[model samples]
Target: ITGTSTVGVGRGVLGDQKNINTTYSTYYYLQDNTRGNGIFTYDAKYRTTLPGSLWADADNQFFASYDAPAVDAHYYAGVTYDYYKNVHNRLSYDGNNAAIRSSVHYSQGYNNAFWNGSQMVYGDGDGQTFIPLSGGIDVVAHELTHAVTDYTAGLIYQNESGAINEAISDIFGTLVEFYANKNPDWEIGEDVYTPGISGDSLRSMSDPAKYGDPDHYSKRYTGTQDNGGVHINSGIINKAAYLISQGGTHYGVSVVGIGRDKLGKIFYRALTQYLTPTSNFSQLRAAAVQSATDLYGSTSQEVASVKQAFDAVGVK
Candidate 1:
């Protein structure tokens, strides 16, 4: 998660590996940009004293300081920071103004990226099919949201807890994409993957059934994979949130579109304020309904749709 403590993993020089790693340990170093995590220049070059090996070969030395890789990282981090601060009233990863660190050029020919316990790690995709993970803002936010989950709820990474983890990330990740005015498709990694590529996204939020993969969780779904199909099963929740946004009916229940803003507000309140680490589908269902009632009114159509959405997905 927190890449090499030195932050020079991709730097080519490989000089003073120990010192570089030590610099990474200093949590505040990332903000310095020029010396630590590096900064993005207007010319789109990453200017830093770090070695070139740590950066992609396509750019000049200090390129990581300002390449597409760096730009994506900077953009996503800024957006994520703003999302948490403005939408959820949260500070950085710790809610204490802690510095957030992200590493680019994680692995050559790597197909996936993830958040460990502390920081976000990005990998260069297969290139044959996938591109860089940082290319998509939602993916960036998705990983960071994992950190947020670890901070709050600390949901177990198995069974329902695992499902909630994946679901929440997908829910917010999709919201972030839409919040950024990107296309609102159910595809996850579509932006990064070359067209005609199979196995594109980790999951689909729009019509999970369309993928026909074992991963996507449908309205009529059961666990088979994805950590009890947690990552896969998350589709139920994702779809519910989507339906809420689109004013669609959930499980035969219907409501006027509440809009993504209101739905996100309801979910944000439920997850951060009322949810417990061990909360399961039933608990989440109740929490959503309660959240809707608290934010809007018990009799409001919002709460009704919230309840129906859960039932639509077999949460009852």
Candidate 2:
């Protein structure tokens, strides 16, 4: 049920028009000089991973082939639509019965996927290192989760609030990936890229260290790259939940399994119910612990695992 834009800011299936100057104005510009057209731009600052300018507008027209852009967009939209509807009881991205319109196969040789202000856009990869952006469930969920973050946390683009913004998206994006069970593995977006790549995903939920990346608070991994590399640094929280769910020893500490669903539920509740736009790691930790206690009681095994997982990730 993707709607149409009410205002003339941008054009898409859902009518959720936004001020082009405000949405993509934050350090990125549209490639085709149509930034004012209301379509979300993917590769703004020339990031190598960013998609083409029209990545969201044009590619979705393909109706044939396994690599068909329309097929990919439609598939992911259906997944995202059902995810919000069935899991959280949310009607759409806004929880207000908004019709979600998606454009796929955007731009020639586009290489990224993004959720514009109102709709979702996908790019066909450069084909050397990546596949069509729509082919991955996690990527679909990742972009949609951005909208969820915008609706709830509204975290600032820099500093702790920005970090929280990215972390929350990763949390649910990974959750969507796990819930979809598309590849039957916890890895994110492994199927969306070429097989020869050294990495298994754009980000890793099971093992963050595999990327040899910095921690969430590390100064070495901050600034305008990857939106503070929120998807990358989010590994800390992602691994925390993964270990807690799997019930394993991490950070040199032994923890018992709290079950994945239970762990996800705790964070989901905290993010959706008790958090604000400026919440930080400490605040999130407190909220999550509080949520665990309230949902499972003070001495429940789930609560213990939740706390241990937080500590294991150095969040407390």
Candidate 3:
């Protein structure tokens, strides 16, 4: 809808007060015109159809109990967009300033969130498992990173490529969280995964084996389930990423830390320049090595750390 850009006040799923970017014609719509082409958020209204309706408000104040998820989805999408533009110098997911869109409250008890190849979709989880998927900024960034992956590496969604794809999302998701300065951690989705348990998240980058995921390539899953363990096997790469960002010794292998910023630079370069659809774990090591070499020189510690991180994870 055509409207003048406006600012609206709202409370997110966690009941925190904040301001959101909106558009106003006759009604206020959750269409932010600040970043890229725009960031549009919609209401799914307990149905499966995407972006069911442009979220409208009689007044430019979103405080209703039902408006919670939309607030976070719209707000976090902006944060993710800013991260790419400011940190990576990429315009948007497509590197061309593509409009960002999302739908909240998708289906009753949906219990998940994802990028549907077009737009991001968030589900209102069963209260026990999750509250609203968008409540977690990492969750929002993780899904949006999927869009970034699709546009760049185009990694196939199966086998080793799929696990690399998943790990890339997780890596960038956590980096975005740090970029936004939102309680930075190497954990994935800790903000909204489980309310009852302490230190809980869907997966752990600091220690993937903390959640029974294989932290080493030697223990990788060869089963056919989970799209050849796409989500399950991502731990191997996630662990290597953690080692690169923050030094750690695993299975008697030690990596010298180069910090997260350098880690992000190397991986971002690899994703955009060297990776391909069928790149396996061994291939990923080479890409990261070459990327680090290009950015920090072949003799730089960054390149050596990249090598050490992958070797530590048994990727060589």
Candidate 4:
């Protein structure tokens, strides 16, 4: 809807109060005009349809419990947009200032969220496995990062390529979490997953094996579930990413950490420049090595660490 850009107050799913950008027509709408083309959030109304009615409020105040998911989805979309633009110098997920959109309350007890190849969709979980997924910044960034990957690497969503895609999402998700300067950690989806449980996350980039995911290439899953183990095998790449940023010894292999900024730079360069649709684990190692070499010289410690991190993960 066309209207004057405005601001509104809202409470998020986590019980935190914050201001959100809105558009003022007859009612306040969650159409943030501050970034890119715009950020539009929709009310899914517990149905399966997409991009449902544009969220509207009479007073521009979103405090109702039902409005919490939309509040965070709209707010966090801006945060992810800012992260890529400021840190990577990329505009929006498509790198061309495309409008960002999201839908919340997507079905009854929907337990997952996804990019849907066009817009972001979030679920109000069964109240056991998750809360509103938009409540997790990493969760939102993770889905948005899929859009970024789709526009850049175009990595196929199957086998090794899919695993790489998933890990890339996780890596950027964690980076965006840190960029937000909240209680950042190398974990994924800890904030909104299982609110009753503590000290747990959907996955751990720092220690993938703790969740029964393989941290090394030798233990990589070869089964057929999860799109040929895309989520399962991503642990190998995630662990390598963790080691690249925070040096660790894995199976007698040691990496001298090059810090998170360089880690992000190398991966961003690789995803945008060197990686291909069919790149496998071995090919990913080559892409990372070349990306690090391009940024910090072939003889630099950055390049050395990139190599060692892959070695530690047995990606060879």
Candidate 5:
């Protein structure tokens, strides 16, 4: 709606105080204009609607308990947009300026969030498993990164290709978290996942084995479930990405850390330029090697680190 840009004060689902971008006409609306074309957030009202309704408040304040998810969804989407633009020189999820949309409070006791090929959707969670998923910046960025993959690599949604897609999301999601510098770590969904459990997350990049996920490629799942175990097998690539950024030893294999910025650069270049819809793990290894070579030279340590990280994860 036509309105002037404004600021809103609110507490997120995790009780973190922050300001969100909004628009004000007769009422304040959750529409941030500072990033790309714009970022619009909506309330799903516990339904399965897509991009339900633009969230509005009579005043610029957004501290109500019901307002928490919307605030985080809106705020985190802005952060993700900024991360892409500022870090990668990419405009939005697409290289063009596209308006990012998100819906929160989708369905009762819902515990998942996803990008539906068009917009982002978040569930309020069943409480025991999660809270509002949008409250986690990594979760929010992970979903948005799906849109990025769709626009860039167009990775297939099953089997090894799908697992690569999932790992790409986790990789960039963690990078965005580190970029924001908000209690950053190698875990995914730690803030909004399992409110009753401490030091647990939906997944871990540092050690995928911590939650029954394979840190090495030999343990990759080959089942028909979960789009051919896209989520389960992603751990292999996730660990490789972690090693590329942080450097580590696994199963007697050592990797030299090239730091997060270089890791992101290589991966982004691979995703945008080298990877295809059907590219599998081996192909991804080649893509990463080529991307590193493109950026840091064929004989540089960056190229060697990429090879060692993939080897450590048994991706060869």
Candidate 6:
């Protein structure tokens, strides 16, 4: 909607205070006209309906307990937008400045969030397993990265392909977390997951086995559940990505760290240019190595590190 750009201040689900971009026409709306055309947020009102009403505030100040999810949903969408634009030089999820949209408060005791192909959806969480999922920038970025993958790699959501899809989200989500630098760590959904538990997360990139996820390809789940273990097997790729950035020795295999920037460059290139809907683990390893070789010569340490990272994770 056409409106005057404005700024709003709010406290998030975790009580972190921050400024959010908003719009004011007749009434203030939670729509940011900056970065990639616009970033809009909505309130799901604990229902299944999507993209609910555009959040409106009379004074452009969001402090109510109910507004916490909306505040972070809106703010984090903008941050993810900025991460892609600034770091990757890409426009938006579609690489076309598409309007980024998010909906919060998505049902009572809902314990998960997703991209739903077009827009982002966040659950308030049962408060036992999770708080508002949007509270975690990594979570928000992870879901948004799904849309990015949809537009780019279009990786199938099952088997090895699905694992790659899931791992890609975790990879870029962690990168976005590091980009924001808000108590960043190589963990997925740490802030919003397990409010009662400290030092735990939905998944661990550094050590996927800590959460019962596979840290090596041989350990991948071959069951029919969870789209052939999209989440479970993603640990294998996540470990490779983590190793590429942080350097680690796993199962007697070692990798040389190439830092986050190079890791991101390689993966981003692989996702956007080299991957496809059916790309499997081996294909992903080849894509990553080729991506690194494309950016930094094949003889460069970046390329060698990519191979070592995949080898360490048993992707070879």
lDDT, candidate 6, 1-316, per-residue tens: 8899999999999998999999999889999997777998988899998888999999998999999999998998888899999999999999999999999999999999999977999999999999999999999999999999999999999999999999999999999999999799999999999888999999999999999999988888999999999999999999999999999788888788989999899999999999999999999999998999889998999999899988887888
Q: List the residue pairs that clash in candidate 6.
A: none
Residue 199's C-alpha lDDT in candidate 5? 89
lDDT of 4 by residue, 1-316 (tens): 8999999999999999999999999999999999989999999999989989999999999999999999999999999999999999999998899999999999999889999999999999999999999999999999999999999999999899999999999999999999998999999999999988999999999999988899999999998899999988999999999999999899999999988999999999999998988999999999999999989999999999999999999888
Better of 2 and 5 by lDDT: 5
Q: Which has the greatest lDDT?
A: 4
Q: Residue 250 lDDT in model 4? A: 90
Pairs with steric clashes in candidate 3: none
**Candidate 4, run of 10 with poorest lDDT:** 209-218
Backbone clash pairs for candidate 4 read none
The positional error of residue 127 in candidate 3, measured at the CA in angstroms, is: 1.0
Candidate 5 per-residue lDDT over residues 210-296, each given as its tens digit? 988998888999989999999989999999999998998988999999999999999999999999999999999999999999999
lDDT of 2 by residue, 1-316 (tens): 0233221133222222223221122222222222112223332222333333432333222222432444444445556656666777776666675554555556667767776676677777778667777667677777787787777656665555666666566666667776776454556667777647755676666776776654333323556676665555567767776777786777577768877678767876787787787777778778888889989999998888888877777777
lDDT of 5 at 211: 89
The regions of model 1 sitting more than 4 angstroms off are: 1-66, 184-186, 195-202, 213-224, 250-255
For each candidate in turn, the TM-score is 0.75, 0.74, 0.98, 0.99, 0.99, 0.99
Rank by lDDT (best first)? 4, 5, 3, 6, 1, 2
Superior by lDDT: candidate 1 or candidate 5: 5
RMSD per candidate (Å) reads 8.3, 9.6, 0.8, 0.7, 0.7, 0.7
Which residue pairs does candidate 5 place in steric collision?
none
C-alpha RMSD of candidate 2? 9.6
**What lDDT does each candidate get?**
0.63, 0.60, 0.93, 0.95, 0.93, 0.93
Which whole-number lDDT from 0 to 100 does residue 198 have in model 6?
92
